[PDB]
């Protein structure tokens, strides 16, 4: 395939045009007074979004040279989103600033690689200053404030996130889902709920709600399928001798045993119910073992130390205070396992979490830990249509990510003032040569961009706002929603440190390497 080659200023200008287009599209969404972007979808209704990475990923250019800069800015935004989950618009604007200022300074005598070295040095100094300015989060009010700021000033979302974190802990499992009503809802799931229904309608004993409900029930855990009458009769005899209900959690129940169970339930009133084992693969075994420790029972059919159903004993069965089974899910609430064994299992899970990490494995381990310790939380997002619901879920996810980041690390001032307060740290550096000085100056000029963008979206002159902020005391910043100068921490305009440093590092890392190019090679368009 034939190719086209460009040198120097023309190539730099075309790439800067692409970068400027993508960054201009992204920048309109930043701050409390930003606006939304509508993106055409090929299979239905368009998206309406206020999210930087979503807007960035949706733009592809016809010209081959502009698309290079567009793709690099997309890489910046995607890396920021993957690492922190928030702060992608800030990263995009910082990257454009660095790229433009770098391109403006290239000449015959310049050495772009040394300029890149100076840029990296300055960014390291800035990150050190940011880490020195951070403070830890200690109160639920700070959690609510962070969530409110991340959700674009919505107090209800912050309140619901704070309540969820209070109920399931600051490191618990919280998920976001679509709602079917006009309003948002918070649902707390306690105990062990594994989403498996009763095998046969004949086991129902509660008319209102169509539920099978038992109290003080024996639990029979079977790793392998139950088929024969010989393997099932002893458990029924044990249960009937003591006059207690029995819940059989097993891989499956076959025709003969199921027929015996239904016949006894119908003609004797025997209190029994059967359910499938949850999870597939080794996860099924892990869940069954977790239930075994939780209820104080044993697992039958294990490959190691195989325990036979034929000689089941009364002490091999778990005990649960309440069992609720319905068509879609089942729940055992109050097990009777030994606390020490449960704590040992929790310790084993949290140690396994630290050994090898993957999204699937981490998700499963966290779910197991939550089911065994504290429970899970579900936030249901409401709205009148799919477009509104998706738009609001974007903000809810941003708020959750920001709150987790602010729990892992501290908080700094919001509104772009945190980066403004790091400018004095760059005045202490002594560059080795002229190119590193150029890089340091590039970073020093770039550090003002976020506050100016926020002020510009608000309809005021950003440069005057930044000048007045820099002339005030360290605790004072600009409230763009109210349009005033206030004490940022007292008003709750705060940001996570991790998001800020991640955005700065990614933007600098990509833009400084972009500004070192001299030749660009592209493919000639096909017919």
* Nearest by Cα to 296 from 353, 218, 358, 383: 218
Per CB under 6 A, the segment of 26-34, 265-273, 343-351, 506-514 that binds ligand ATP is 26-34
Q: How far apart are CA 60 and CA 13, in angstroms?
A: 18
From the CB of 41, what's the least distance to ligand ATP, in Å?
19
Taking CB under 6 A as the rule, which mask of x and - marks residues 87-116 in contact with ligand ATP?
A: xxxx--------------------------
Q: 37 or 247: whose CB is closer to its own copies?
A: 37
Q: Report the site for ligand ATP in 388-417 (rule: CB under 6 A).
A: 398, 414-416
Residue nearest to ligand ATP (CB): 414
From the CB of 32, what's the least distance to K ion, in Å?
10
DSSP 315: G
Instruction: Flag whether 88 is marked binding.
Output: yes
Per CB under 6 A, the segment of 9-17, 245-253, 369-377, 473-481 that binds ligand ATP is 473-481
Binder of residue 281, out of K ion, ligand ATP, its own copies, none (CB less than 5 to 8 A by kind)? none
From the CB of 519, what's the least distance to Mg ion, in Å?
17
From the CB of 31, what's the least distance to its own copies, in Å?
11
DSSP labels for 487-500?
EHHHHT-EEEHHHH
> Which two tokens mark 405?
């980041």
Instruction: Flag whether 163 is marked binding.
Output: no
Any contact of residue 191 with ligand ATP (CB under 6 A)?
no
HSE (side-chain half, CA atoms, 13 Å) at 235 = 32
Dihedral sign of CA atoms 47, 52, 54, 58 in order: positive
DSSP 201: G
Q: How far apart are CA 319 and CA 411, in angstroms?
A: 46
Q: How many residues does the chain have?
A: 527
Burial of 110 (0-12, 13-18, 19+ CB in 10 A): middle
Instruction: Flag whether 86 is marked binding.
Output: yes
Q: 32 or 191: whose CB is closer to ligand ATP?
A: 32
Instruction: Flag whether 135 is marked binding.
Output: no
Helix (H) or strand (E) holding 219: strand 212-222
Residues 6+ apart with CB under 8 A from 28: 34, 35, 37, 457
Any contact of residue 350 with its own copies (CB under 8 A)?
no
What does residue 335 show for φ and ψ, rounded to 5 degrees?
A: -70, 170
Give a three-class secondary structure readout of 283-312. Answer: HHHHHHHHHHHHHCCCEECCCCCCCCHHHC
Contact (CB, 8 A) for 517 and 504? no
Contact (CB, 8 A) for 494 and 146? yes
From the CB of 90, what's the least distance to Mg ion, in Å?
9
Binder of residue 149, out of K ion, ligand ATP, its own copies, none (CB less than 5 to 8 A by kind)? ligand ATP
Per CB under 8 A, the segment of 213-221, 241-249, 322-330, 370-378 that binds its own copies is 322-330
Contact (CB, 8 A) for 146 and 414? no
Kindly list the residues in this chain that would bind K ion in the complex (CB under 5 A): 29, 50, 52, 89
Q: 69 or 414: whose CB is closer to Mg ion?
A: 414
From the CB of 298, what's the least distance to its own copies, in Å?
14
What does residue 457 show for φ and ψ, rounded to 5 degrees?
A: -65, -20
Residue nearest to Mg ion (CB): 398
Per CB under 8 A, the segment of 134-142, 156-164, 401-409, 515-523 that binds its own copies is 515-523
Contact (CB, 8 A) for 383 and 182? yes
Taking CB under 8 A as the rule, which mask of x and - marks residues 18-57 in contact with its own copies?
A: ---x--xx--x----x-xxxxxx-x-xxx-x------x--
From the CB of 354, what's the least distance to its own copies, in Å?
8
Binder of residue 415, out of ligand ATP, its own copies, Mg ion, none (CB less than 5 to 8 A by kind)? ligand ATP
From the CB of 429, what's the least distance to ligand ATP, in Å?
24
Any contact of residue 454 with ligand ATP (CB under 6 A)?
yes
Any contact of residue 31 with ligand ATP (CB under 6 A)?
yes
Burial of 252 (0-12, 13-18, 19+ CB in 10 A): middle
Chosen residue from 269, 358, 428, 519 binding its own copies by CB under 8 A: 519
Q: How far apart are CA 162 and CA 149, in angstroms?
A: 13
Q: Report the site for its own copies in 219-278 (rule: CB under 8 A).
A: 259, 262-263, 266-267
Helix (H) or strand (E) holding 49: strand 47-49
Where do contacts with ligand ATP occur on this chain (CB under 6 A)? 29-32, 34, 51-52, 86-90, 149, 398, 414-416, 450, 454, 479-481, 493, 495
Binding-site sequence positions for ATP: 50, 86-90, 415, 495
């Amino acid at each position: 395939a034939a190719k086209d080659v460009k040198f120097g200023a023309d190539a730099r200008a075309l790439m800067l045009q692409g970068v400027d287009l993508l960054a201009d599209a992204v920048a309109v969404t930043m701050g409390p007074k930003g606006r939304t972007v509508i993106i055409e979808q090929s299979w239905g209704s368009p998206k309406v979004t206020k999210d930087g990475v979503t807007v960035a990923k949706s733009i592809d250019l016809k010209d081959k040279y502009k698309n290079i800069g567009a793709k690099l800015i997309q890489d910046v935004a995607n890396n920021t989103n993957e690492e922190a989950g928030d702060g992608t618009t800030t990263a995009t604007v910082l990257a454009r600033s660095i790229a433009k200022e770098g391109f403006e300074k290239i000449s015959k005598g310049a050495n772009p690689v040394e300029i890149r070295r100076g840029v990296m040095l300055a960014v390291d100094a800035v990150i050190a200053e940011l880490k020195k300015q951070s403070k830890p989060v200690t109160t639920p009010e700070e959690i609510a404030q962070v969530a409110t700021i991340s959700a674009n000033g919505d107090k209800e979302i912050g309140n619901i996130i704070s309540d969820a974190m209070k109920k399931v802990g600051r490191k618990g499992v919280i998920t976001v889902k679509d709602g079917k009503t006009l309003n948002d809802e918070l649902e707390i799931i306690e105990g062990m709920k594994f989403d498996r229904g009763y095998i046969s309608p004949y086991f129902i004993n509660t008319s209102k709600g169509q539920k099978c409900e038992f109290q003080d029930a024996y639990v029979l855990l079977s790793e392998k399928k139950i088929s024969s009458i010989q393997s099932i009769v002893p458990a029924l005899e044990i249960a009937n001798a003591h006059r207690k209900p029995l819940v059989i959690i097993a891989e499956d129940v076959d025709g003969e045993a199921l027929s015996t169970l239904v016949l006894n339930r119908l003609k004797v009133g025997l209190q029994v119910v059967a359910v499938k084992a949850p999870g597939f693969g080794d996860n099924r075994k892990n869940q069954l073992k977790d239930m075994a420790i939780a209820t104080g029972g044993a697992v039958f059919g294990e490959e190691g130390l195989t325990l036979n159903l034929e000689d089941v004993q009364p002490h091999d069965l778990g005990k649960v205070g309440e069992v609720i089974v319905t068509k879609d899910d089942a729940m055992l609430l109050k097990g009777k396992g030994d606390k020490a064994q449960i704590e040992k299992r929790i310790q084993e899970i949290i140690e396994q979490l630290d050994v090898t990490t993957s999204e699937y494995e981490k998700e499963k381990l966290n779910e197991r830990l939550a089911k065994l310790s504290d429970g899970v939380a579900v936030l249901k997002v409401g709205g009148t249509s799919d477009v509104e619901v998706n738009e609001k879920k974007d903000r809810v996810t941003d708020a959750l990510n920001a709150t987790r980041a602010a729990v892992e690390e501290g908080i700094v001032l919001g509104g772009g003032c945190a980066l403004l307060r790091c400018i004095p740290a760059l005045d202490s550096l002594t560059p080795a040569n002229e190119d590193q000085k150029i890089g340091i100056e590039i970073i020093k000029r770039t550090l003002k961009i976020p506050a100016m963008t926020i002020a510009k979206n608000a309809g005021v002159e950003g440069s005057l706002i930044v000048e007045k902020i820099m002339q005030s005391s360290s605790e004072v910043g600009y409230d763009a929603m109210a349009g005033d100068f206030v004490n940022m921490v007292e008003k709750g305009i705060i940001d996570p440190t991790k998001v800020v440093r991640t955005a700065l590092l990614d933007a600098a890392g990509v833009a400084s390497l972009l500004t070192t190019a001299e030749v660009v090679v592209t493919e000639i368009p096909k017919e």
